[PDB]
Structure formats: structure tokens, C-alpha cells
Design a protein around this motif. Structure first.
Motif, PDB file in Angstrom:
ATOM      1  N   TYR A   5       1.691  15.148   2.925  1.00  0.00           N
ATOM      2  CA  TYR A   5       0.484  15.242   3.742  1.00  0.00           C
ATOM      3  C   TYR A   5       0.831  15.755   5.125  1.00  0.00           C
ATOM      4  O   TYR A   5       1.764  15.243   5.767  1.00  0.00           O
ATOM      5  N   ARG A  43     -16.066  12.619  10.574  1.00  0.00           N
ATOM      6  CA  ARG A  43     -16.596  12.711   9.221  1.00  0.00           C
ATOM      7  C   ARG A  43     -16.261  11.490   8.360  1.00  0.00           C
ATOM      8  O   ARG A  43     -16.545  11.472   7.163  1.00  0.00           O
ATOM      9  N   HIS A  80     -15.601  24.137  11.341  1.00  0.00           N
ATOM     10  CA  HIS A  80     -15.172  23.429  10.144  1.00  0.00           C
ATOM     11  C   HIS A  80     -16.083  22.263   9.942  1.00  0.00           C
ATOM     12  O   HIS A  80     -16.663  22.083   8.873  1.00  0.00           O
TER      13      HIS A  80
HETATM   14  N1  LIG Z   1      -3.436  23.377  10.114  1.00  0.00           N
HETATM   15  C1  LIG Z   1      -4.797  23.337  10.192  1.00  0.00           C
HETATM   16  N2  LIG Z   1      -5.586  24.155   9.448  1.00  0.00           N
HETATM   17  C2  LIG Z   1      -6.936  24.154   9.513  1.00  0.00           C
HETATM   18  N3  LIG Z   1      -7.603  23.310  10.315  1.00  0.00           N
HETATM   19  C3  LIG Z   1      -6.936  22.432  11.113  1.00  0.00           C
HETATM   20  C4  LIG Z   1      -5.475  22.404  11.099  1.00  0.00           C
HETATM   21  N4  LIG Z   1      -5.094  21.468  11.966  1.00  0.00           N
HETATM   22  C5  LIG Z   1      -6.211  20.925  12.509  1.00  0.00           C
HETATM   23  N5  LIG Z   1      -7.313  21.504  11.997  1.00  0.00           N
HETATM   24  C6  LIG Z   1      -8.716  21.206  12.359  1.00  0.00           C
HETATM   25  O1  LIG Z   1      -8.789  20.201  13.360  1.00  0.00           O
HETATM   26  C7  LIG Z   1      -9.382  19.011  12.865  1.00  0.00           C
HETATM   27  C8  LIG Z   1      -8.636  17.811  13.407  1.00  0.00           C
HETATM   28  O2  LIG Z   1      -7.334  17.911  12.864  1.00  0.00           O
HETATM   29  P1  LIG Z   1      -6.255  16.730  12.998  1.00  0.00           P
HETATM   30  O3  LIG Z   1      -4.909  17.403  13.056  1.00  0.00           O
HETATM   31  O4  LIG Z   1      -6.709  15.887  14.172  1.00  0.00           O
HETATM   32  O5  LIG Z   1      -6.352  15.906  11.592  1.00  0.00           O
HETATM   33  P2  LIG Z   1      -7.740  15.513  10.830  1.00  0.00           P
HETATM   34  O6  LIG Z   1      -8.330  16.743  10.191  1.00  0.00           O
HETATM   35  O7  LIG Z   1      -8.566  14.773  11.842  1.00  0.00           O
HETATM   36  O8  LIG Z   1      -7.372  14.477   9.625  1.00  0.00           O
HETATM   37  P3  LIG Z   1      -6.435  13.148   9.764  1.00  0.00           P
HETATM   38  O9  LIG Z   1      -6.752  12.584  11.129  1.00  0.00           O
HETATM   39  O10 LIG Z   1      -6.857  12.250   8.625  1.00  0.00           O
HETATM   40  O11 LIG Z   1      -5.010  13.617   9.582  1.00  0.00           O
HETATM   41  C9  LIG Z   1      -9.272  19.171  11.363  1.00  0.00           C
HETATM   42  O12 LIG Z   1     -10.249  18.402  10.659  1.00  0.00           O
HETATM   43  C10 LIG Z   1      -9.431  20.665  11.172  1.00  0.00           C
HETATM   44  O13 LIG Z   1     -10.755  21.127  11.402  1.00  0.00           O
END
Ligand SMILES: Nc1ncnc2c1ncn2[C@@H]1O[C@H](COP(=O)(O)OP(=O)(O)OP(=O)(O)O)[C@@H](O)[C@H]1O
Ligand SMILES: Nc1ncnc2c1ncn2[C@@H]1O[C@H](COP(=O)(O)OP(=O)(O)OP(=O)(O)O)[C@@H](O)[C@H]1O
Ligand SMILES: [Mn+2]
Lengths: 441, 437
Positions: free
Chosen positions: A161, A50, A133
Motif C-alpha cells: 500500500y 470521503r 479526484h
Molecule cells: N500518487 C498519487 N496519485 C494520484 N493521486 C494522489 C496521489 N497521491 C495523492 N493523491 C491525491 O491526494 C489525495 C490525498 O492523498 P494522501 O496521500 O493524503 O492519501 P489518501 O488518498 O488520503 O488515502 P489514505 O489517507 O488512506 O492513505 C488522494 O486521495 C488523491 O486524490
RNA sequence: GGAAGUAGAUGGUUCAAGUCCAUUUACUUCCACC
RNA sequence: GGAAGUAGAUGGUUCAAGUCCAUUUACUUCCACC
């Protein structure tokens, strides 16, 4: 400066540059060529898909969609197979839900297995909402990515964060939802300021409500609190941060702070100035993932902290640290030393049979009468807090989480004062004691 | 030795010998002669007039009667003047109701003015009930006057006889009333065991009762609590005492043991063995009678003890001592020294306006959030319970009793460690610390 | 693994435990690891 | 002098303490000095 200019300058801190984007696109192309060759159902989810990822924090998320009929065991086996099959090199560690972490063309990847569902109502694995999501966010996040990046920068810099137990802060997805709910970083911050601990934010319904607790309703699954693991304290930290940012805006909120190298001499003086008992319990770090260590580390702390308080050593704050091979449990007490003797409540003078039993015991001093109640003087087996937890921890190791409680059993020690200051715990110490002017950049 | 064989021995310590009574009757004839010769309505009351005084400590009670018409002052003027006239060497020092203490032929005397009432109801003077006590109790004790004497020695060997604020114990009259209710010292001891703070004894109708608090009724004035000044603790001591005597009776329950002379060295060790902070506030003793003094020492000490607890020094007990020229408020504390930093509670993060003010206060350490709300580290002004009470006594002298307060205001020292033990407060430290040698 | 809730049962501490300190069986949750 | 109580009047502390520390005016008992 005006808030608008502070934010333009903040964008250079949070937007990946074309160095990093390039490195991600061609990592994406390779990952696809490999997965296609493997003819498997997959989908890019997460911040990369995204374009809501932060500068210098790139991680691609590949989800593999398995049939709902698959057992938990088969989901694992194939998951890791493909994951291994697809990465230049890899690493497998997880607390419960299986996945493989790795690298393609120098960029970090998570390949995650999950179930392909028609509805995210009821869920086999724990990650089954993730491709939903994305589908929910995909159309609603467009052109607001930089708002997301701003909020993710603001959070990271301020140490809140991430939803993992190490942070107990704001998930990446929570950030995206907020930007969708509030329009923009600024508008998120301006509103965040009046969040109570009972603010319910129902994104899908576009509603703000009062509930039992803070609760962000997952658009994809209504039962789901997106901010389920956001500590009440980090919620508080966040709304304070917001209130503070809007009084005096500053690029500072977006740059992270770092502990200053503090002399074991200066904090000797600080501790004695305070005149408190400060010591830690030092033990070997159980070789388990982060998300398993930290709750048990929190648990260990609470349990000793409570032991310390019912033993009248008047504890102040507690903290912990996990180095490479050791974990520490830090504590500070108001009482460095307590008297050997204390009071014990006795039966009321009239209750003859219990008075009989009460002086039955062999005591150094004679029991007395006060406000029409018998009372005794008895001895304590310890008189300092270090002595106390030395005893507590020796006999109560079991109650300190499965893994630390066991490592504490095999070995622990107490360090206090100058000896403790040459241990890699000073940052916590400073933080715990509210020491001023010991962070920078 | 069985049960009744202990009352036998005790009789020599409680019943007045040949000499003692004979010095009384003549010191009584001498008194009627001066008083008659003055032409006053007067009437003998108290232990001597009822043959109910303990051996060794005799005191004749004479009551000047007056019309009700006399002003508060008039009662007092003639009362003192007639007194001075009647005695040999004499003394005046009272807290409210004017009497005159003195000596005749060699024995101690009290002569008290009072009003001649029709009934002890809407009682004018303070002590008006005493003649009307005598009128009811004379003909109901005729022959059981040795049952009070056994009770008196018992209580007086236990330092819990005497209704005055130094003793908070059993009134002489009350003991007389416990015989007329029960019939014998032994039977009195028997029931005592199942006395509670809830007990109401009605002498008037001879009926035990679980009323308000403890209440021995006066058959002379139904609304009097004859047990008015017996402490709850001192009650508790008597009822435990009677349980001990009944299960293991001894003459030791009548011997007044003389407060152990425990050396200054011994308890310096015990106190150091206990590892507690034990100090005293020393100040000059106000020139006031006991009955105005001890309640003030109670208050002074209570207040400081309550300071101590709220200041987190964890006090164990307190005590006090009145000497020639000095008073001592004693304390023992679990904490010898507390840290300089403490926690102040802030407001919940939501409350922006109170958070802003709470954070604006200058401190040495960053405030923090814990469990929803702000908290702050603050530096105490003192770190030891001694620094503590020095500061408290300095500022709060006025709340420490009318006179002791004035005295503390002028001067006091906080004495502890080595200097303390070479002062006349050792007896009180033992008691307070529950020592056995 | 951690937390929560339900129905238990043991130990230890105390004059006194359904309440304090631990232990453990059963069951319904939730969270973190994406 | 001390304590229990009715009707107010302040002052300090504290982010806020009508609830913590004190102070004060009335009217009301009650206890010790016998
Ligand atoms: N604790 C959580 N609660 C809800 N959704 C989650 C959670 N952890 C992961 N996800 C889902 O998995 C996706 C990937 O999560 P990840 O942990 O890889 O971080 P991210 O959302 O990609 O953001 P960033 O990489 O910037 O930290 C998220 O966008 C979300 O849909
Ligand atoms: N606190 C009191 N309550 C009720 N009556 C009292 C009180 N004090 C004194 N009296 C009355 O005054 C009388 C004289 O009291 P006093 O203080 O001389 O001692 P006593 O009661 O005569 O006994 P003794 O002299 O043996 O100690 C008593 O007999 C009693 O009737
Ligand atoms: Mn990611």
C-alpha cells in the motif's frame, strides 16, 4: 472459514472506531474555524473527506486553492504561511511540491497549496488533480467505503500500500477507483487474479483493454496512469496474493507480518549452508527525504549488481536498508573467489596487423591459438566480490545517485559475515535469501 | 646470416647422409628379390621411391597390386600373407585398411595391398590413390626434391607435420604438392602468409581461390582434399610461423626443442600463482591404435569441457595425454568452488497453472518474483569442478568416445593438487597454461 | 532527485568502440513528495 | 574409431525445454591408419 465470515472479521481490523472518528470530527471543526477566520479558499479532499481512511491511520487533507496566475514561488510562500498559521505544530519537508505537515487537536494534517482550475487538462502544480479526484469520487464512492478500507487493509498488511518510491505499491486513490470499477473488495480480488502486465483499466469508460503496460486511466485526466509507479513486481505480488486468497481465505492476509529476531548464529549457519559471498556496503545516510533517498538507493544497488555480474562474481539478489544514520547495500554472490587469470579474445590469425598489435603487449603467459583466433591470458586486479566493489565504489561513486554517490565518496566500507550480522539488516538478509519461517503475527 | 644462408645449414638436418641412402638401396634390392621370387605385381611408392624422405626417418613404401575382382576380405588375406612372407620381423595394427609394418636389413618397411584401378574415381580401397600419386608426381619433382626436404624439417621441428589424428598437420604428399605448385620452400613460405581459412589451392590448374573452406585439391582426384585433416588451428600455426620466419629467419625454426623438464615444484607455484582449479581425469588407456584413440580423447575432453562451462566453472583450456598404460584428460578452471545455492528460472506470474506447479516443488528457500517472473533458489549436487566431473564422467561415460568411455566406466580417478604434478603430464600443462619457463 | 526519450561531445577500456565502462551539453517527457 | 548429413524412435531434466542433457534405427557422405 467461508470467505464472507473472513471479511466480517477483517472489518474489525480496518474500520476506525468512534474513539478515532470523534477525534477527527472535532479536529475538522477546529481546522475549519481557523481557516474561515483566515478567509481563504480551501477544500477537504482525501480519505478523510470521503470516509475511506483505515483504522489507526487518520490523516486529514486540506487543500488551499490559489489563483492560476500565481507563480510557483508565490504558491509556495502563501501555502506554507497558511499551513503554518493553521496548525498546533508543524513540519516542512517535501521533495518538490510544497506543503506543510502538522497536527491539530492531536490529529495529523496535510495542508497543501494548489491551483484552482476549470479543467484538470494541463496542470500547473503536481497536485492539481486532487480536488477534481474528490469531486469525481464524492458521489460514486458512497456506501462502498468499507470495501475501500478492506482493500487498503489487504494491501497494507501485504506491504504494497502506497505509491511512494519506498513502497512502489497501490495508492489510496487507486484503491478507491478499483472499488468503483469492480463493485467491492471481493470482486476486485476475484478479477485482479487475471490482470496481465498489459491490463488497461479505463474507469471512466467502464472498459478493460490491452495496452503497452499496466495502466489505470484517471477519470479526471485521461493521460494520467494512476498506477504509474506500481512496480511490475508488486503487480505480480498482488495478483498472486489474490489467487492465493481465493484458494484458501484467511484472516492472515489482513494481519501484517513482522521479521523475527534472528540469531547472528543461525544465519551464520544458513549462509555457510548456501556457501555464498554475502556482504553489504555501509555508508552514512544522506539527510534527504525518503522519496529522494530510495531511487538513488535503488540505483546504487543496480549499478554494483551489474558491476558484479560483468565481473563474473555471479550475483544472486540485492537489497538495501536505511537506518537512522546509515544506509546499507546488501548483495549475495555465487562466486566467493575467482582465479587471478582470465581469457581475452584476440584477432583472427589472418588479420596480420592486429595480431602484431595483440602480442605487442607485455604478458606473463604466452598467447595461444584456438578455433582460428588468437587469445591471451591476463590478470585481474581483484579476485573476490568484496575486493571488486571496494574498487568499483571507490572510483565510481559518482554513478551511484547524486546524494548517496557523494556520501559513499566521503566514506563507505564493506562488512561481511558475522560482523555484518550484528547490523540492523538481518530482516533484508532473511528476505533476500528466501529464508523460511522468519516472520510472524 | 641472410635469407638463403639459413636453408644452407638446415640441409645437414634434412638431407640423408652417405650411410643412410646406401642402407636403403641394398634393403631395396633385397626386397625386389623376395617379391619377384613370389611373383606379385607390386610397385614402389612414397618418400623413398621419390627420393623425398627426411634424413633419419626413412620408410620404404611397397604396394601390392590386385585385380578389382578380389573381395574386401580377399584383398586383405593375400595382402597380409605376402607381407608376412616378405619382411623379417613384422607387425600388424591398423584402424581400417590392412597393411603390414616391418624391418629389412635394418630399416623400417610398409607393405600395403590395394586395387589396380583404371582411374582414381569411385576408388575401391582406401589407399588406391597412392600409386596414381606417384605416377603424376615423380616427373614433376625430379630436381626440386630438396624443396620438400626443407619444408618437411621445418614442419617436423614444429610438430605440425603428419596428417594423422595425433598431429592434425601437413601430409607428406601435401608438402610435395606445395613445391610443385610454388617451386621453392622459400616462395611457399612467402605466400603462406596471405593464406586464409577461405583458401582453395588448385594444383590441377595452378590457381589460388577463395572457395568454401581450406582445400588443397589432388590433381589425381579433383574431389580429394589433400589438406583434409589439417586443423584450423594448425593451419593458423603454420601461417603465423611463415610470417615469423620471413621477418626474423633462424635455424631455430628447424631445431626440434625438447619439451621442457619444468620441475613439479615450479608449476605447482605457477598454478597457485594463477589461482585456478587444475585437475585431470586419469584412467587406463584402451589397447587401440592411435588413430582410434586420439579422436576419442578429443571427444571425451570436449564433452567434459562443455559440461564445465555449462556448469559455471568457467574453464580456460583443456588437453590430454596418452602414456604407457594411462590416459589423462586435463582441465583448468577459473572457479575452484561455487556456492551451493543457484537460481532456477520460473514462469511469468500471469501463467497461474505453471506458477502453481513451480511453487509446489519442495525447496529449502521461499521462491521470489523478479522482473515479472518467478525464480527459485536450488541446491547444487556438487560445489567444486572436481566433484563436478566425477559426477559427470560417472554418469556420461558412454558419450566420452567408444573406448575411452568403456574405460572411464570401469575406473577413473580425478587427480589434482600435489598428486597431479608428479605425473607425466607437465609438458602438457605448460603448453596449456602458456608458460614461459 | 529518479526514470524515459532525442540531438550531441568528451574520457577510459580493447587488436578493434555508434555498441563495453564512465563523463558531459542541449531538448521533450514521466514519477515520487498531497 | 571419429566427424559432417538426411529420415524417424524413444528416455532424462525442467513450470514448460520438439530449443538443455543423453539415447537409438535406418540411409548418406568424409577423415585417420599408406
Ligand atoms: N500518487 C498519487 N496519485 C494520484 N493521486 C494522489 C496521489 N497521491 C495523492 N493523491 C491525491 O491526494 C489525495 C490525498 O492523498 P494522501 O496521500 O493524503 O492519501 P489518501 O488518498 O488520503 O488515502 P489514505 O489517507 O488512506 O492513505 C488522494 O486521495 C488523491 O486524490
Ligand atoms: N593422408 C594422405 N593423403 C594423401 N596421400 C597419402 C596420405 N598418406 C599417404 N599417402 C600416399 O602414400 C605415400 C606414402 O605415405 P607415407 O605415409 O609412407 O609417407 P610419405 O608421404 O612417403 O613421406 P615420408 O615417408 O617422408 O613421411 C605418399 O607418398 C602419398 O602419396
Ligand atoms: Mn490522508
Amino acid at each position: 472459514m467461508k470467505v464472507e465470515e473472513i471479511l466480517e472479521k477483517a472489518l474489525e481490523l480496518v474500520i476506525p472506531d468512534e474513539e478515532e472518528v470523534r477525534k477527527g470530527r472535532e479536529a475538522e471543526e477546529e481546522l475549519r474555524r481557523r481557516l474561515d477566520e483566515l478567509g481563504v479558499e480551501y477544500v477537504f479532499v482525501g480519505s478523510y473527506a470521503r470516509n475511506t481512511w483505515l483504522k489507526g491511520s487518520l490523516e486529514i487533507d486540506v487543500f488551499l486553492l490559489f489563483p492560476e496566475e500565481f507563480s510557483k514561488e508565490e504558491l509556495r510562500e502563501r501555502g506554507l504561511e497558511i499551513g503554518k498559521a493553521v496548525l498546533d505544530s508543524y513540519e516542512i519537508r517535501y521533495a518538490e511540491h510544497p506543503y506543510v505537515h502538522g497536527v491539530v487537536k492531536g490529529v495529523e494534517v496535510d495542508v497543501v497549496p494548489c491551483y484552482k482550475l476549470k479543467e484538470p487538462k494541463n496542470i500547473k502544480s503536481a497536485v492539481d488533480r486532487t480536488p477534481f479526484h474528490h469531486k469525481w469520487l464524492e458521489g460514486r464512492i458512497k456506501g462502498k467505503e468499507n470495501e475501500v478500507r478492506l482493500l487498503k487493509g489487504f494491501l497494507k498488511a501485504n506491504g504494497i500500500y502506497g505509491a511512494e518510491y519506498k513502497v512502489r505499491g497501490f495508492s489510496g486513490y487507486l484503491c478507491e477507483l478499483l472499488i468503483v470499477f469492480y463493485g467491492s473488495f471481493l470482486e476486485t480480488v476475484k478479477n485482479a487474479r487475471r490482470w496481465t502486465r498489459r491490463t488497461v483499466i479505463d474507469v471512466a469508460k467502464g472498459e478493460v483493454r490491452k495496452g503497452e503496460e499496466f495502466f489505470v486511466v484517471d477519470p479526471v485526466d485521461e493521460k494520467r496512469n494512476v498506477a504509474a509507479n506500481l512496480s511490475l513486481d508488486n503487480l505480480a505480488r498482488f495478483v498472486h496474493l489474490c489467487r492465493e486468497f481465493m484458494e484458501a481465505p484467511s484472516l492472515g492476509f489482513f494481519k501484517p507480518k513482522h521479521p523475527l529476531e534472528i540469531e547472528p548464529e543461525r544465519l551464520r549457519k544458513i549462509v555457510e549452508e548456501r556457501g555464498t559471498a554475502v556482504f553489504a556496503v555501509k555508508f552514512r545516510k544522506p539527510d534527504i527525504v525518503d522519496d529522494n533517498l530510495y531511487p538513488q538507493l535503488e540505483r546504487a544497488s543496480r549499478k554494483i549488481f551489474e558491476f558484479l555480474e560483468r565481473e563474473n562474481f555471479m550475483p544472486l539478489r540485492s537489497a538495501f536498508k536505511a537506518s537512522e544514520e546509515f544506509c546499507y547495500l546488501l548483495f549475495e554472490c555465487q562466486i566467493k573467489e575467482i582465479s587471478r587469470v582470465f581469457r581475452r579474445m584476440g584477432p583472427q590469425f589472418e588479420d596480420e596487423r592486429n595480431v602484431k598489435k595483440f602480442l605487442s603487449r607485455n604478458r606473463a603467459f604466452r598467447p595461444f591459438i584456438e578455433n582460428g583466433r588468437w587469445w591471451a591470458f591476463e590478470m585481474r586486479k581483484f579476485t573476490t566480490p568484496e575486493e571488486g566493489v571496494r574498487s568499483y565504489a571507490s572510483t565510481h561513486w559518482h554513478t551511484l545517485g547524486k546524494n548517496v554517490g557523494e556520501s559513499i565518496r566521503e566514506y563507505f566500507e564493506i562488512i561481511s559475515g558475522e560482523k555484518l550480522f550484528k547490523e540492523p539488516v538481518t530482516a533484508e538478509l532473511c528476505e533476500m535469501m528466501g529464508v523460511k519461517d522468519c516472520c510472524c503475527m
